From a paper:
Therefore, the β-xylosidase catalyzing the removal of xylosyl from XDT would play a prominent role in reducing both of the resource waste and pollution to environment. Here we present the crystal structures of LXYL-P1-2 and its complex with XDT. Each monomer comprises three domains as some GH3 members. Sequence alignment of LXYL-P1-2 indicates that Asp300 and Glu529 might act as the catalytic nucleophile and the acid/base residues, respectively.
To improve formation of good quality crystals, LXYL-P1-2 was endoglycosidase-treated before crystallization. The first 43 residues were missing in the electron density map, partially supporting the existence of the KEX27 cleavage site (Ile32Phe33Arg34Arg35). The structure of the four monomers are essentially same without any remarkable difference. Domain 3 (residue 664–803) is connected to domain 2 by linker 2 (residue 601–663) and has a fibronectin type III (FnIII) fold. Seven Asn residues (81, 272, 342, 385, 457, 576, and 635) are found to link with different types of oligosaccharide even after treated by endoglycosidase H. In LXYL-P1-2 structure, the distance of these two residues is 5.5 Å, consistent with the proposed retaining catalytic mechanism in GH3 family. In the substrate free enzyme, Glu529 forms hydrogen bond to the side-chain of Arg218 and the main-chain NH of Ser466. The catalytic pocket of each monomer faces to the outside of tetramer. The tetramer formation seems not influence on the active pocket, but contributes to the highly thermal stability of LXYL-P1-2. The interface B was never reported in GH3 family.
Numbering used by the authors:
A (entry chain C): 608 to 804
B (entry chain A): 43 to 804
C (entry chain B): 406 to 607
Write the structure that this text describes.
Amino acid sequence: LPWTWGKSIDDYVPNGVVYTDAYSPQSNFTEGVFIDYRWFDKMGITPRYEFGFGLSYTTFTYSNLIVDHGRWAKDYSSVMETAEPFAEWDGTNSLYDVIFTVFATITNTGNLTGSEVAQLYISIPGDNQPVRQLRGFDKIKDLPVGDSAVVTFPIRRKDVSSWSVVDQLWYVPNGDFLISVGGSSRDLPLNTTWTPH
Amino acid sequence: ESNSTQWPAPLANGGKSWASAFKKAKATVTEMTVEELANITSGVIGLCSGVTGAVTRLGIPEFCLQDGPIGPRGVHGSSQFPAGLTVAATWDRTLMYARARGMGQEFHDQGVHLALAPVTGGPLGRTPLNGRGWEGTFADPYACGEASYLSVKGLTDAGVATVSKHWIAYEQETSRNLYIDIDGVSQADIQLPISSNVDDLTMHELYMWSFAEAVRAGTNHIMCSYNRINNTHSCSNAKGLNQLLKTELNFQGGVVSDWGGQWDSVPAAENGLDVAMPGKGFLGALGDFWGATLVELINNGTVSEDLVRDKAVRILTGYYYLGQDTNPPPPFVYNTIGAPTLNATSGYRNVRKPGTAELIKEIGSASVTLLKNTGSLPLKHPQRIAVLGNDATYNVLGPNACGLANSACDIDNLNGTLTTGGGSGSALSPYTITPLEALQKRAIEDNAEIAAVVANSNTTTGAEDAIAALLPDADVTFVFLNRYSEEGADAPDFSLGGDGDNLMDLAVTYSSNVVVVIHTTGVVDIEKWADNPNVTAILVAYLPGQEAGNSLVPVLYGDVAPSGKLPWTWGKSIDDYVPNGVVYTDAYSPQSNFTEGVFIDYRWFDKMGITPRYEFGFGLSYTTFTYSNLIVDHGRWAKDYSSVMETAEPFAEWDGTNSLYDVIFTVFATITNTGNLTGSEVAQLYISIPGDNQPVRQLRGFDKIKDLPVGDSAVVTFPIRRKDVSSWSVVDQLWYVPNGDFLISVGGSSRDLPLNTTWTPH
Amino acid sequence: GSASVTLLKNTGSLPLKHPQRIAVLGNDATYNVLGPNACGLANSACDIDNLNGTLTTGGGSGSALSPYTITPLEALQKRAIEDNAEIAAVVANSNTTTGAEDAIAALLPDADVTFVFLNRYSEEGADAPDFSLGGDGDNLMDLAVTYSSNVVVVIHTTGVVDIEKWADNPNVTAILVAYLPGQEAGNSLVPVLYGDVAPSGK
Ligand SMILES: *[C@@H]1O[C@H](CO)[C@@H](O[C@@H]2O[C@H](CO)[C@@H](O[C@@H]3O[C@H](CO[C@H]4O[C@H](CO)[C@@H](O)[C@H](O[C@H]5O[C@H](CO)[C@@H](O)[C@H](O)[C@@H]5O)[C@@H]4O)[C@@H](O)[C@H](O[C@@H]4O[C@H](CO)[C@@H](O)[C@H](O)[C@@H]4O[C@H]4O[C@H](CO)[C@@H](O)[C@H](O)[C@@H]4O)[C@@H]3O)[C@H](O)[C@H]2NC(C)=O)[C@H](O)[C@H]1NC(C)=O
Ligand SMILES: *[C@@H]1O[C@H](CO)[C@@H](O[C@@H]2O[C@H](CO)[C@@H](O[C@H]3O[C@H](CO)[C@@H](O)[C@H](O[C@H]4O[C@H](CO)[C@@H](O)[C@H](O)[C@@H]4O[C@H]4O[C@H](CO)[C@@H](O)[C@H](O)[C@@H]4O[C@H]4O[C@H](CO)[C@@H](O)[C@H](O)[C@@H]4O)[C@@H]3O)[C@H](O)[C@H]2NC(C)=O)[C@H](O)[C@H]1NC(C)=O
Ligand SMILES: *[C@@H]1O[C@H](CO)[C@@H](O[C@@H]2O[C@H](CO)[C@@H](O[C@@H]3O[C@H](CO)[C@@H](O)[C@H](O)[C@@H]3O)[C@H](O)[C@H]2NC(C)=O)[C@H](O)[C@H]1NC(C)=O
Ligand SMILES: *[C@@H]1O[C@H](CO)[C@@H](O[C@@H]2O[C@H](CO)[C@@H](O)[C@H](O)[C@H]2NC(C)=O)[C@H](O)[C@H]1NC(C)=O
Ligand SMILES: *[C@@H]1O[C@H](CO)[C@@H](O)[C@H](O)[C@H]1NC(C)=O
Ligand SMILES: *[C@@H]1O[C@H](CO)[C@@H](O)[C@H](O)[C@H]1NC(C)=O
Ligand SMILES: *[C@@H]1O[C@H](CO)[C@@H](O)[C@H](O)[C@H]1NC(C)=O
Ligand SMILES: *[C@@H]1O[C@H](CO)[C@@H](O)[C@H](O)[C@H]1NC(C)=O
Ligand SMILES: *[C@@H]1O[C@H](CO)[C@@H](O)[C@H](O)[C@H]1NC(C)=O
């Protein structure tokens, strides 16, 4: 699923569609960033089918979560560049530089061949922050029974940053970032903590 | 102090894309003891062609270095891909890449860390008799360059490090004289390797060109060749490895020796070599100049320890850049060395994926090149079909009977369809789809009869009579010819293999609708029959791999129009090519003077005013194309962003920001399908660079339009880089855009160029 | 062909499932090297030692010309390709061809199944001298049982042949006689071997 499948419309962001005859109709986005699955996770509401859920005819076991801070790369391959300001900028630098890469292993532990969409989520620390934000996916094609495959998630500086309203720039916040990996937004067998400074 | 070399070994720094991998490599190498440094830089015994020693204390595994440039060799459960020669003839960049990507998938899945592939301009094509010219692509620096870029890129994209080969001016097999020292008798006591004697302009403009592109694509490694250059071994040639390769091309990777390519311990260590292969493999018989000897050399002070650290850094950069530490390949399972050199069992693995057979077929259909057609092709629905030649059917001993290198069958054996050549760049085959099978299938769809004479027509009782009785009533007769050649020898002449001469003689005697198909490693002699009124069509299908019949037959019957074109020149005689193409001598120090300069293949033919039978870039379709509206857009330029790695090639126009590979203008032309059938067309662009002793024209563009319908038009486009319009100044030692009038030409071949215009720089 | 091919021995190797490495022995598995009709208007003018391919009919006035032959090798390969398998045939004379014996010895040990195709041509105007197999049939069987323990034998023949040396060898897991199947030799046989249709002839 590319969105959350709730049991009721009443479980989603309130005032999702406003109905008025008023001359100047208003939709206040007071939920903030909390739409779709991050509304359900923050409010402790259980969906019927969660964001990133879908079954196969086999099952996959996740193992061996690795955070490799030496697997970094300059962003050179974008067709055009933004000018988004960020605190860590030193003139030779970018928000879209990959600053580390994370890996994990999946094993086909059921009884048929299958493909698996592995997903990565991150809890970025701060005030009123989502429980989990998706920051990676990798679809393994046609994994035979018993075989394993490594799954790969490049993490950009932007992927681990927050917007500072006061300073008007992106920044990587201080605190503990949880990195979760698994088969859906609520099926996350692997987790680990990254602490920057 | 002890500065023995004129050109010092520059330290690796990671360059552009490998920065983080370099940092890891350097970090690991800093921890290594002298013993460990010598372990990773020298080969050990194993199942693969070559194996680096482990560094077991730091968790660095052995690396499997495995042949070859059509995919993993000596391995079951894989596909037999078409040879480089065959993708070249497609002139299709998409196929060039996809071929290499699929080879890469099968390499990785077999457990290979380093593929001994591709062939990226050594041999390039100085002699059309080169036994392993087939392993390369075009006999042209520009097109070989583009093909090499894409072949490397496809391999590295699959996670397998490339060892692009063979650096450099490795232009004949004869007297290559790999180093052997066994039972007292050293090769050093018999004959040194052939010395390619190459002037500085030729080295830059012809031979280095393709290797520059391989370096830019991110080839992780380079193999130094068997020949000598100016009487110095390529593998310990400091001008070659340290300055040309490592300084000027700014090559950040490892130089690996060819097997027996290293002839000494200390000069190799000082002059650019990074890995000794095979080391302890092959009984130590191919020399073993490092290992414990390199520990001894470092400890007693004759070889710099920091020098050897840089070698180990270069080896590991690829390991870390391609993610082989965190996504390691699975174990390699097959004994590809062979008993009695290595006694060891083989396991089994199947790595053939859906889509790979179909890709190989399509490379075949896109490359098969129509050379002659008087109107016999395409076939309609012929009812009585005759076939001639053992090439139409299976090897009578089985497709893999000739062994791990496709070279151990007896001299007269009927080897069947020549789907690949002989030597280290061959591979096994899960089956062969023979031309006869594919022809018969189609015959049965038309309710027709088909019969093949596939024996040896000279030595098999009744074979001549059988041919005499068969051919007269056939509506068409197909003769399948081949010409096997191999690594370690050059072809003596252009003569067809086996009974090919006699098959043709008989075919034209008894039939008036003879269609010739040639599976071959190179140009052959069909002068006796190509102008025979009974030969109604001729094609060359090169080395099509396992899907030989099913790639061919759809073209013969007109399901797809042929669109392949020759990647080298087809001369009427061997005497028409560059002279002294292969030197035969018993002299202790054999010499090959490259006095022809840049003038090889079509550039020789053009310069000397010799007309080939079929020119470079020639191939017929079942329709015709008309060229129009030549445009040169000096407004359409672009900075070069998209290379994986960067060279340090000096050039006069350098301003601190720009590059040799920026596109400075783009050229366009329009083709119109001007016949009665849909057809694809390879458009080609040639430039006459002004100057003294300059080629008449040099290929600088190609663009293949696919399936252009009758009466429709397409725009064909040709980006031109600064390098594409430059020359090497020997005096100033840099590239520059010369002054004068440049002729830019566009058309369907090197000698069919309806569009021309002039560009004058300032 | 599919209604006539007669299963004489089965130790449990047949029907085949999806074998991944397949070896094939015998010139009978492929074409007449001079063409299906090379032996003339009565299928009897080929040289005594000529490799006549699949014996699809007998010699003499009872013969007939053939528009093609669907060889056993062609049909087996088609099915091997459907199973993503590999397949190799040694189809030369195993006694007189250089390296043929060594190719067989190197191929067979790793094969999941080894098919041996044998024949025995006979003709109008002479009786067979004995039950012995034609061409190199005896030698093919000696080599096959030496190097493989899953040998499936298929016999194309005009009559009874002598298989006493190998009929009770447990390396021979199945024996079938296919008589003279005419033009559709291979495509009648393979569906029986792979169990799309149970053998039914007697
Ligand atoms: C195998 O052997 C061949 C044959 O020996 C090797 O070729 C030689 O490579 C050398 C470099 O490695 C080349 O050296 C340069 O020579 C320049 C002068 O060249 C002329 O002089 C000689 C006179 O005897 C002559 O051979 C040349 O003739 C050839 O070229 C012309 C022009 O195309 C042709 O018409 C002829 O038919 C011949 O083909 C020339 O006429 C020389 O100026 C150059 O300059 C130096 O460069 C070095 C390195 O950077 C530097 O240390 C020096 O300071 C100097 O550069 C300075 O001057 C320039 C401006 O003038 C400036 O830009 C710099 O910054 C700096 O201030 C260099 O010495 C040699 O010509 C070449 N020979 C031939 C015949 O090709 C080949 O490399 C060998 N291969 C291997 C793998 O070992
Ligand atoms: C089916 O597939 C089979 C393989 O699976 C094919 O069989 C192979 O076929 C090739 C040729 O098609 C055949 O090639 C070699 O045959 C003999 C084998 O021992 C060699 O003589 C040949 O090599 C010489 O000749 C070449 C051309 O003349 C030459 O390029 C090569 O370098 C070599 O010449 C040197 O040797 C001579 C000394 O006797 C000198 O006169 C000559 O000048 C050269 O000298 C150099 O090297 C010498 C070292 O020996 C040295 O003394 C001297 O100083 C100098 O440095 C040729 O390659 C294979 O052998 C054959 N394989 C087998 C197993 O038989 C088969 O053809 C195919 N079928 C069909 C129908 O095509
Ligand atoms: C120098 O290189 C040699 C050859 O690579 C090293 O020896 C080899 O060390 C490897 C470990 O890296 C051994 O392989 C291992 O075998 C075990 C089972 O015993 C298996 O569980 C592992 O997965 C791995 O495959 C190998 O046996 C051994 N080979 C030989 C011939 O001794 C040597 O250690 C290296 N020296 C240094 C100082 O690093
Ligand atoms: C292939 O067929 C030919 C005939 O077309 C066979 O040759 C004949 O064999 C008989 C014995 O059965 C001889 O008495 C004849 O004289 C042979 N005829 C000729 C013209 O030589 C041949 O034996 C067959 N090949 C094989 C391998 O069995
Ligand atoms: C939206 O926000 C403003 C204050 O920013 C508030 O006064 C207003 O009543 C809100 N409108 C609705 C429809 O909730
Ligand atoms: C150093 O050791 C090597 C090989 O053991 C030897 O060839 C060389 O001569 C030695 N150097 C000295 C100074 O002994
Ligand atoms: C062409 O074929 C006919 C028989 O079809 C033959 O008589 C004639 O001599 C042949 N011509 C040449 C030049 O081969
Ligand atoms: C190669 O060139 C030199 C001159 O540079 C010449 O003297 C030598 O004899 C040439 N070699 C041959 C084999 O002609
Ligand atoms: C059966 O085959 C095996 C090899 O697979 C061989 O060792 C054995 O001798 C053979 N036995 C007979 C009785 O032929």
